[PDB]
Amino acid sequence: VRYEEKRELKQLLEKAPIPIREDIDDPLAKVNVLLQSYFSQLKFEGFALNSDIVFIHQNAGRLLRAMFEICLKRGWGHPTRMLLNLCKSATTKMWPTNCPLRQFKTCPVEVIKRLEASTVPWGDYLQLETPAEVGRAIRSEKYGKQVYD
Amino acid sequence: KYTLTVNDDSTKEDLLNFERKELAEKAKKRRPSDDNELVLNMSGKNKRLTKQINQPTNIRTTVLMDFQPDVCKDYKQTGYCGYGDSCKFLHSRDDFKTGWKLNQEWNDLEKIPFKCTLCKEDYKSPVVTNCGHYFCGSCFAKDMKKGTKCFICHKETHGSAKVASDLQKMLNKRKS
Amino acid sequence: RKETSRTATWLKNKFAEENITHKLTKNDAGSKQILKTEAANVLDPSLRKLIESGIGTHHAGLTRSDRSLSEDLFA
Amino acid sequence: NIEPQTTAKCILYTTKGNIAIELWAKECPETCKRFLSMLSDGTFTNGEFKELKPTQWLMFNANSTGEYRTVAEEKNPRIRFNRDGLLGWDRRRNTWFITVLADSKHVLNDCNVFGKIVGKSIYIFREILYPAVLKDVEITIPFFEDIFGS
Amino acid sequence: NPLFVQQDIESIYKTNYEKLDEAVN
Amino acid sequence: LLIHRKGLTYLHLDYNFNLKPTKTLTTKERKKSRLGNSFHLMRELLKMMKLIVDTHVQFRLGNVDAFQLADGIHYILNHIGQLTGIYRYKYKVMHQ
Amino acid sequence: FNQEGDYNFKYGIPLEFYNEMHRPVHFLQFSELAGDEELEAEQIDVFS
Amino acid sequence: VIQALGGIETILEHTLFKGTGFNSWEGLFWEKASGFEDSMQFKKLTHAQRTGLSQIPNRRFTLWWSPTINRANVYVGFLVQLDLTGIFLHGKIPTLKISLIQIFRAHLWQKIHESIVFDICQILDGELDVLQIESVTKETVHPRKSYKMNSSAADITMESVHEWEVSKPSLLHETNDSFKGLITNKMWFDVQLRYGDYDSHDISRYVRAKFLDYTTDNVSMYPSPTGVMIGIDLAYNMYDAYGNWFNGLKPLIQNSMRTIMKANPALYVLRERIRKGLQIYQSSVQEPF
Amino acid sequence: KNEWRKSAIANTLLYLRLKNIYVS
Amino acid sequence: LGTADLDERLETRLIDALLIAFQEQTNSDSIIFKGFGAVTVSLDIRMKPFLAPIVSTILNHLKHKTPLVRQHAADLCAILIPVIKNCHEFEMLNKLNIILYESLGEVYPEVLGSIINAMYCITSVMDLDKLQPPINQILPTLTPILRNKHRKVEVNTIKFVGLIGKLAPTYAPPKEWMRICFELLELLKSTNKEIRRSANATFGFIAEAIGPHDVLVALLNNLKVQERQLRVCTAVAIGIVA
Amino acid sequence: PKTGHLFLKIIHTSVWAGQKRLSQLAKWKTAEEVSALVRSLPKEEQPK
Amino acid sequence: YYPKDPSNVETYEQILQWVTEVLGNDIPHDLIIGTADIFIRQLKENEENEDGNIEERKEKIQHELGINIDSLKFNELVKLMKNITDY
Ligand SMILES: [Zn+2]
Ligand SMILES: [Zn+2]
Ligand SMILES: [Zn+2]
């Protein structure tokens, strides 16, 4: 932790949604809050932190896959399913409570924000049958049949 | 559900006049009821409702517009009135509209002809001047055999001619 | 990426602080008019202030149409 | 509003939502018999919104009641086309007519003004401004007690 | 005289920093 | 037909016999469109009649009942100062 | 929370008190949608 | 004689004191004759300008007692509406009409309505995330709409990111709302202006009656069954609102209405014009302190 | 308010309270 | 020395003290306005949190019954205008200008002249299209004020008519600019040399808009008077038009 | 605050002599007496 | 000048924020702390006996160091340096 970065890391630490026991002067917290900002797709100001977070996510794919292979081998259920989501978050750049249509690149912006706050079980959007019934559920007829595909 | 919306315009009551008429009937009966003395409205002295006149509940309303502006005409046009302060009408000065353009006499436009000014045909082996003109190569070499300048401007060309590759961009349909 | 536009604007001020700005660009009616009509294509206004004075910028934060344009002007 | 008192209500169940509808059965006995019959005989069911005419009308449930015949023309000049949401009736074989927002008087004396929409569900009708279809029909108030279903 | 005293007075209240500081200290 | 023969088409006569201007008038049109008391007394009289006649139309349409019809006829006759402006043109009708 | 509501039930594994799915607010407040930002040629991963 | 007329509160209920915006009446001061009335000319003064008596004192007096002079009174068969306003004139009184058309001049009734629709859109536009608003669109308004007094339309149309759980229609200051029941995607706002008199109804009863009238009109066109009618009484400096409320709306509109009634420039110009046609002043500058 | 973080940290150690189980 | 030495607490205390000394002034001494102009030019953008309470204080004093209190309030408005511009508060400039416009009917000439000066100061700062009320409303309201006989109203009004004739001349019709020419002609009889000098500048601005020859005829006919001041001031104006 | 009417509801010491935790029993008595006060007013006089 | 007090760190960090907004955040890290080493020395060491002209002191710092600062930007830091307790 350098001295000028502490103004900004304190601002990330309140956007950070999964808690950290450490303080701001520990290197264990800097790698922690920077990975949680990559998953949230946040923006920075510093030069050094913008090159640090690029180094984190390029390593974070393998290091989460290695921890997945251990905990699968040890016969552990509860750390396995958590670490299997963290392998998905590392490539798709998103938390597990977001809309699964964010993985499709060609899904329009207005439909995603409506599905994230709809509080409907997302399996109900899977069993829609026609693009007319999809377009009513997302309240957009002209973005029916794209979402249906 | 199972009831039917009822057209009631023949006997439809104004809501506000009906509420005011009920409140006036209540305040008629509050005064005879004995051993009451308390005013928290602060308007018991004025007796606020009794001053107010309630129009009928069954009146339906019809409105005339008053269109006459009552503006003093001499004041609006010239800024001067002979009457002055004893004038019966309004001394406002409005309605000026910024409608004229400053011209000082005392001092998707197609600007390109499709045909030549010399061939009057299609641009074949075309030419740009130092102006925005466009000629053929045969147009420009012959226009310079008599005249020294540009057929439209009659400005100095000095015999210079860039080749007009941008015309065949625009004279086609794909634009590039 | 920020040391790119910091250096180019240092050089742009420096040449104007020495009455030699006319050296950067080649001075010609044809060369001025080509450079003006290509500076109106760029999306960053920061490069547009630099491209008009004969100094380019090429970093990976620029888009392809901006990066295609500076290399064609430099060539 | 100089229009008479309505007499028969028929709730429509579409995919967009519920269309509550009231009808003039005394002032117009024939066109109610072409309407209330074909609701209960099912010939209106699964009918698409067919042809929107902008600022004029939209049309659905075009199929035909009986013998593919016409309708005896009846007009009351208390019942006119001045609003939107007014049911009409084309002179062709057994076809509805729902007036838009421009409410022109050029469609009058050429069609049969037949019923209204109850004002709660005019907002459902304004959603149309993948056409809608007709799922279920409930005739809550039948005026023709005797003729209908006998 | 005027009906209200508020017409005839100039200032309703003026902060005298001299007397208030003597009383504090 | 009298209003139109004078040329006063900026003056609108509605079916409850109100005369309504539609427009701002010039000085010339204002001098030209002043109607006398004999016009306006005739109009207010048609207006009292149209009032009573339409009270009978509502009953004959079935909108009001017989007891409401009698109460409305009795209401019009006691409120002709409130309902028509007949006193503006011949003021001695305040006796009636 | 509908106290007088009716819920559907199934067999499963329960969640913890401060689970992700019990706090969907804390992930949708500040998150931004992903865009494609090119990296310098020395920052690209040598693995993939 | 003040005591025999019922006190100063009973006297001032007859007047335009509340339209000025002043809080109290002990420092009220009328402009006196200064010696500068004919300090514009010297001899360049016609016979009317030297001899004729100024209209400005009669207008000053009449404007002051105008809610009692122009009171609704008894129905005479119809009422006349002053053009480009919603001011009804309840007699043919020429001194009143001039000082009212001076106040609402250069289209101030239309301009007041546009300023407030403009301010409510700028307040909703900053609360988009908290209230879950997709978009706020102020509508294309017919130029006649702000002073049409028998029907209305929406001014602002609101749209939800997901969904709104709205309570049944109530007033802006009631506190017991359920929000269970109705579900809506769309809300609107209607802004109503009003100029009342001594015999007018209260602003609360007024907004509630026009809301219930217009939403069952068959004449007004609304984008949804649910919305808010905001009424503003220009003569008495008052406001109220009535309609369907979701969680967060009431508090937001309560605070926003308080700051628009003190900082909107069109309303500020209205109070300033009313003050000049009254020619009234304050004796003190120390009231904010 | 952010005080749940201290509660969420302390709920990681709820599995240690089952070392002593006292049935009355 | 400037004000760059002062911390945030002395800037707070200094501005508060100047406002007290302005609120207590009972005579027409001008140093309190030179004092405000000096402090606000020193700290320019640091002035920005203080702008909203000073403007509401100015708006309050414009409602007060003493004419000398109303006059100082519009003098302090005119001093503050370039600092309100520099702090980029364009909503605050248009609020002041619509309220000053509503006071142009003032009877006291010493108050009225300083209202016009402040509307001149706002207008020469602003973008003319963004100005409230628009110039085509402002200029016809200024034209009868040219017949006011007091000198502080006159010399402030000729400047504000002449500013509009430079910057926005097509917002008035030509027959309105000629009614100003026939009034500036009556303003040449003034015993003040500023009034005569700035009225002659205004004939230049009017002639650049609507042309020479309507203005030449009125000037040539004014050469037939007996009085020398009038003939010498129309001879200056003809060479300006030329 | 408009009329200046002061409704002083005197509370005798006899109510406190038999209970404990009086500091939140006090506020439940105040809400009884204020609501008993509001009901005794006629509806022209009841507060908004 | 080194960070050794709890109060002074909270104002030492936002002096470094002044420096990175003047020079740029993409310069090397010692060169940010090397530059704030200068400015604290030029303002505090002479502070106890300073004269009234702050604009001549503003020009001497700007000229002996060869770095051009806006006058309005410099006055931000003069108020930050007025806060610092231990030196
Ligand atoms: Zn006049
Ligand atoms: Zn050719
Ligand atoms: Zn040419």
Side-chain angles (χ1 to χ4, degrees), chain B residues 72 75 81 83-84 87 89 91:
Chain B
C72 182
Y75 195 83
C81 187
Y83 283 96
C87 182
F89 299 120
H91 278 182

Side-chain angles (χ1 to χ4, degrees), chain B residues 1-27 32 38-41 44 50 52-176:
Chain B
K1 293 177 175 62
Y2 291 95
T3 60
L4 288 81
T5 60
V6 181
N7 203 166
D8 279 324
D9 285 343
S10 65
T11 54
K12 184 174 70 172
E13 288 183 352
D14 193 0
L15 178 58
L16 292 163
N17 295 322
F18 177 77
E19 294 167 354
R20 177 178 281 169
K21 182 169 75 174
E22 280 187 347
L23 291 165
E25 287 172 350
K26 293 171 182 179
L38 195 69
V39 172
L40 292 174
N41 284 303
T50 68
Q52 287 178 349
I53 293 162
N54 200 177
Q55 285 183 355
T57 312
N58 61 344
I59 282 303
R60 79 180 294 163
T61 55
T62 165
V63 185
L64 274 72
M65 298 306 300
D66 192 352
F67 292 100
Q68 302 299 315
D70 286 334
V71 179
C72 182
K73 179 166 184 170
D74 286 342
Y75 195 83
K76 195 182 77 176
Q77 293 188 354
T78 73
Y80 178 74
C81 187
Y83 283 96
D85 283 332
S86 66
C87 182
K88 192 169 73 163
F89 299 120
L90 177 64
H91 278 182
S92 178
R93 186 143 161 74
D94 288 325
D95 197 72
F96 276 159
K97 294 289 188 180
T98 62
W100 70 278
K101 181 180 180 178
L102 192 143
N103 195 2
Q104 301 185 354
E105 282 183 345
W106 54 89
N107 275 314
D108 291 334
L109 305 175
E110 286 179 350
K111 285 186 176 182
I112 299 167
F114 290 90
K115 300 181 180 184
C116 305
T117 68
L118 291 166
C119 292
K120 285 187 178 178
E121 298 179 356
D122 276 327
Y123 283 148
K124 289 185 180 179
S125 64
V127 150
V128 195
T129 63
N130 292 321
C131 302
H133 306 298
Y134 294 100
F135 295 103
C136 284
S138 62
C139 297
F140 185 71
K142 291 178 184 176
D143 194 79
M144 292 299 294
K145 283 173 185 177
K146 292 184 177 180
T148 60
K149 335 168 158 173
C150 42
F151 189 76
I152 304 165
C153 285
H154 301 282
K155 285 180 182 179
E156 290 177 351
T157 63
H158 304 284
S160 69
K162 289 180 184 179
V163 165
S165 62
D166 287 332
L167 289 178
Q168 294 176 356
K169 301 184 181 180
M170 297 303 291
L171 291 172
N172 293 318
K173 299 177 180 65
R174 295 178 181 175
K175 301 287 177 65
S176 64

Side-chain angles (χ1 to χ4, degrees), chain F residues 23-71:
Chain F
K23 193 181 75 178
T24 307
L25 305 184
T26 55
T27 300
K28 176 181 279 188
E29 283 171 343
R30 210 275 320 275
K31 295 179 180 186
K32 176 63 72 174
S33 67
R34 290 165 192 165
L35 294 163
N37 291 332
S38 75
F39 180 79
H40 289 291
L41 187 57
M42 194 70 231
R43 179 183 61 81
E44 297 288 340
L45 210 65
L46 282 161
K47 175 162 187 166
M48 173 180 167
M49 177 201 72
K50 172 70 163 60
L51 230 27
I52 277 139
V53 169
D54 289 338
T55 299
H56 287 269
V57 175
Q58 297 290 337
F59 170 73
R60 289 288 298 274
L61 289 173
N63 289 331
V64 306
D65 86 84
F67 289 93
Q68 287 175 296
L69 169 69
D71 184 81

Side-chain angles (χ1 to χ4, degrees), chain A residues 2-4 6-7 45-47, chain L residues 13-14 16-17 25 29 32-33:
Chain A
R2 300 294 178 183
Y3 281 89
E4 303 89 5
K6 288 166 66 177
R7 192 185 183 96
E45 295 187 357
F47 174 74
Chain L
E13 293 175 358
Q14 59 179 350
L16 295 177
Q17 184 63 38
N25 59 3
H29 173 72
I32 295 166
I33 300 173

Side-chain angles (χ1 to χ4, degrees), chain A residues 3-147:
Chain A
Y3 281 89
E4 303 89 5
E5 293 178 347
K6 288 166 66 177
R7 192 185 183 96
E8 189 180 6
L9 290 168
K10 189 181 289 293
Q11 298 182 0
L12 265 67
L13 196 148
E14 59 178 354
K15 271 80 175 175
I18 292 172
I20 295 169
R21 291 171 64 190
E22 287 80 358
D23 60 349
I24 200 166
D25 294 337
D26 194 358
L28 296 178
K30 183 177 179 182
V31 182
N32 194 347
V33 71
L34 282 175
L35 182 59
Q36 304 184 9
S37 299
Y38 176 75
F39 292 161
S40 300
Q41 289 293 108
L42 296 176
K43 303 297 191 295
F44 300 105
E45 295 187 357
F47 174 74
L49 290 177
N50 279 316
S51 61
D52 286 331
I53 192 170
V54 169
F55 178 70
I56 302 294
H57 70 80
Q58 289 181 356
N59 295 322
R62 294 184 297 115
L63 299 175
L64 293 174
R65 187 66 181 175
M67 293 165 68
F68 169 72
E69 298 292 330
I70 295 173
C71 295
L72 185 63
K73 193 75 175 67
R74 299 289 178 267
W76 291 342
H78 195 197
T80 301
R81 294 171 292 167
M82 295 190 291
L83 288 170
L84 182 55
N85 290 326
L86 290 173
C87 293
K88 287 180 181 178
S89 294
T91 61
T92 60
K93 303 188 283 188
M94 56 187 284
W95 291 100
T97 72
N98 296 123
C99 180
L101 292 176
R102 290 173 64 91
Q103 273 173 339
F104 292 101
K105 287 175 68 73
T106 62
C107 181
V109 176
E110 306 293 323
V111 183
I112 292 173
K113 305 298 187 295
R114 186 172 297 167
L115 293 177
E116 285 184 350
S118 67
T119 68
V120 178
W122 194 76
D124 293 335
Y125 293 95
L126 292 171
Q127 63 173 358
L128 296 178
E129 298 292 327
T130 65
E133 185 174 356
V134 171
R136 184 169 69 252
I138 66 170
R139 295 182 291 169
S140 179
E141 298 291 324
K142 74 184 183 71
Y143 293 123
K145 183 68 176 63
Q146 289 182 357
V147 175

